[PDB]
Structures are given as C-alpha cells and as structure tokens.
C-alpha cells in the first residue's frame, strides 16, 4: 500500500 510507503505516498495525492 502506497500510503504506508512514504515515497509512493507522495505520488498518490488522490489516495494519500
């Protein structure tokens, strides 16, 4: 889950 991923969190502003 990209939200639990600090790096991937950034590229998913729609989720995170």
Helix, strand, coil percentages for the chain (3-state, nearest 5): 25, 0, 75
What own/partner pairs with CB < 8 Å and gap ≥ 24 does 11-16 have? Answer: none
Q: How far apart are CA 14 and CA 2, in angstroms?
A: 11
- Judged on CB neighbours under 10 Å (0-12, 13-18, 19+), 10 is exposed
Helix, strand or coil for residue 7? helix
Query: For residue 8, what are its two tokens?
Result: 């991937």
How many C-beta atoms surround the C-beta of residue 11 within 10 A? 11
Q: With the CA atoms of 3, 15, 7 and 10 taken in that order, what torsion angle do they form, in degrees rounded to the nearest 10? A: -150
The structure was resolved experimentally with: NMR
Alpha helices for the chain (secondary structure H): 6-9
Phi, psi of 7 (to 5 degrees): -70, -40
């Amino acid at each position: 889950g990209c939200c639990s991923h600090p790096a991937c969190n950034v590229d998913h502003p729609e989720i995170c």
